[model samples]
Target: TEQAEEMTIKHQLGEAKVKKNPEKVVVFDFGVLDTLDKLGVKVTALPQMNVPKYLEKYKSSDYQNVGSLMEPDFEKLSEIKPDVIFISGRQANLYDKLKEIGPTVYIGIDTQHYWDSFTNNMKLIGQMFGKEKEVDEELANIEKQIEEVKTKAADKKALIILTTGGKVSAYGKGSRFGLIHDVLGVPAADPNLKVTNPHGQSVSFEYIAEKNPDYLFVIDRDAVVEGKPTAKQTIENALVKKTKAYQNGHIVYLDPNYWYLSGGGLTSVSEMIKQVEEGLK
Candidate 1:
């Protein structure tokens, strides 16, 4: 018996092509790699970064790190000779340069709707790999887990904070960090906190003190680097100490990688749910 293959047209780099079971895949972003891993597809190469404690289970020497997400090593990428390269708009400037090496697919990471970005990427990867059914199953599983978390977090208010450049910021309902609000049904500390930028809006510890959220999800940006003041420590040292989160010990510090680096993927989302569930308890 022969398996019937469904054909669909995909636009890559302004050109249309029919693809099936893409081989020798290269991912410039770990978020892309994370999604591929969940789809059971092994990538040829990926960017290097500190593995968030939550994703440590999947980290290994098997995958070669070309470089950081923002800057890729074309020499290493050329050595891999990948059939396709998955990139993001954030790295749009490298499109032509990467295309010279192989077919490059520009994946837009929906910073606003992180979950939708994950789902969209999953579907795209599924189509690329000819694993549409598997993608559907993975999405269903994610939906189930989200529902489980929502059930446990029935009327809880949640706030996500990102500390960077000696400043604090909050993610509101439609912000990149808003995935928690959409998925877990958590309310933002302030409705006006919503912003279009995925990096988030700069805020003062005084502002957070006034909102007084029930739960605080902190992602310290400086923690991503070595020998820097962590976002957690900075928040604690600053006005965060005077807030309800600190007073009640509801400040949940999450891995900077999952929260700030590779956020638009299923792996990060699952990790977030796990951390939130523990914090809610």
Candidate 2:
């Protein structure tokens, strides 16, 4: 039998096929963007959002901006006629719209099975772009670092928190950011913390003090989007001040953009691991 003209890839949404290599690609997922950039794959368009400063050129008018994470300018996207469209969490709703334009697939990272899913997604990206060997090397490099952190992270209990408007929310095993605990083997400070409807288990400063985790991982919600009041400013209350994390200074103020904004990407996940390795020590 002759080799098929199109290459098919299976995803959560279903299976789809594209030509051997996609030149005119529109990637809405940062994880996909990071993979493409790492592999030096040229994308026809990228969604406009709070992208890292390093990727400033992609935001320019010379390159196409396919709206934002919340909404896609369907008219503009249709005109460009991308070969494939990659989407994730927020854009999952737009599957119908993307179907009209091109071969779209959701490359969403499984937060519960973070590293495994991330590596698989990377391999899929590499396969699509004809860089499987590169992906293998990159994944090995990332896995080596992850192993180092896992060793250091042993016997440690961490409380991952999100601070907004002078309130706190905890995330654990099944949450959107559960990769920190589930994948890395960081024991949850509060095992019973419930996963909220959309996100975050609302908790008070007193709860954090009661939990008294060895390490405190914080994501500044406002700072990630609006760049306003810091995590320290929100978590510096009396109840939180007496915790072991505060006294031992094990509270790590992580870069919110990587953790929250563009999470589950190759470059960002590397940064996430690097942060854990450097901070947890």
Candidate 3:
């Protein structure tokens, strides 16, 4: 393939005119890092933290650390002089500062519609690197897997919930975690659920029993990394234990790093369906 001249990435707020095949890239968001990695693009640097086990390549000292996702080191960032910089919701506020150093694109997604955001971000990433063919293939694979899960999940009512610090929340159609119910064709146990927190909707243990979904998908906010505690023991109280999902052993614990913190990445999105298909099986 011939080298492209230029590429443009547009967002709801603005667009960026970037050079084609950008190298020396610095990624602030893990999901964007996941997408780029899947597309065969290696990042020059990333924020320091405990990356998902599947993405330990970034945790190595080989890659520079500009800063943490919550705070970027402008001095280190400028010194690196990257060709382009990628950020998401975690660093959305640093847009102005990030662009001052180099081209910056906000790859954040609308959790209310995760699948759309995932595709659009991948498209932009593909354009920047001229990897449209690879991007299409990855998206196709994700769709195929979603279809398989949808078929098996037929007639299964699902309730998506989050647990952290012993508290709980719920999400339904149109919520940040709605992809499980919306894209997967899994009927929502409570269609009226509110899309409240990026974490989840605040609910009580009794609420789980009330909804009584066929499957309970649990994302443990407290367990993003290995050291953090999980929600398993916290949610297995008497109230929740009485639920249909609990009684049927249909509770599926998901990795918070993928679904909660770094969602909408090409790989994470594909794996989300695989997780559901596993629960169905």
Candidate 4:
């Protein structure tokens, strides 16, 4: 019998095969870091910028902070010399520079498709570290939870609002932050707003009064600032008291850390679903 040469599929890391385990990993986006952590991957370096409140377990000593979200400390990153660097679309400008340091993957934070983004990152990380089965299991769990939420909120209408300096921005269907509607089957208060801005539509308190959505999930930018009240109070003070959401007490003020800082991560998405579920109840 003639001995045939064995063909091997080479992974992009210049290895003949994917590493059984990635020892050094750097994460520039909170969502990417959180997803990798959820999949049981240990991150050596994570962005120090606006750490999510829900990830308090790792905030103190679990990993080193290389730098903020927008500005990463290249010197520190080089020192770590990660096998893989995870970033998001928000920092696409540094893609080339980051790749020069190590193998980097730009995980698009599709705010409108948060679940998709999570799973996509999971798959990407899984491929890099050869943890495909683990990724699949985690994704299945997320999908199951989402399905449950959808079944419960099938008859409800949800409005995802972003409050900046007391100004209200509504994210309707297809908007970047409109994943609540897309993933949970929640109806939009004003379908027309979807066409105007796929991410969000800026509106006054009077405008919200007219639409009068059933459920209001408010994300307050000011909440992150020191000595600021909840999004509910901010909107109420802005003459939005007339809206059904305010009047009926259907407004759910999301924590600024999860809603604003880390919008598309598994942790953020899970916290969001929990809040919305409680609001529905």
Taking all chains together, each candidate's TM-score versus the true structure is 0.83, 0.94, 0.93, 0.82
Report the poorest 10 consecutive residues by lDDT, candidate 3: 221-230
Q: Quote the positional error of residue 235 for candidate 3 in Å.
A: 0.5
| Candidate 3: pairs in clash | 169-201, 170-201
Poorest 10 consecutive residues of model 1 by lDDT? 9-18
Backbone clashes in candidate 3 total 2
> Candidate 2 on 29-106: residue-level lDDT in tens?
876787788889988888776665446567877668788788887888989998999998878888987888899888
Candidate 4 residue pairs in clash (backbone atoms < 3 Å): 175-198
lDDT of 4 by residue, 39-90 (tens): 7777788876557666655666668777877788888888888766767655
Model 3 bad stretches (over 4 Å): 1-4
How many angstroms is residue 59 displaced in model 4 relative to the true structure, after the best TM-score fit? 3.3
How many clashes (backbone atoms < 3 Å, residues ≥3 apart in a chain or on different chains) does model 1 have?
0
Q: Model 1, stretches more than 4 Å misplaced?
A: 1-18, 49-64, 152-155, 227-229
How many residue pairs clash in each candidate at the backbone level?
0, 0, 2, 1
Stretches of candidate 2 above 4 Å error? 194-198
Candidate 1 lDDT over 74-117, as tens digits, reads 89889987778878755678888888887777775665666766
Which has the greatest lDDT? 3
The C-alpha lDDT values of all candidates are 0.72, 0.81, 0.83, 0.68
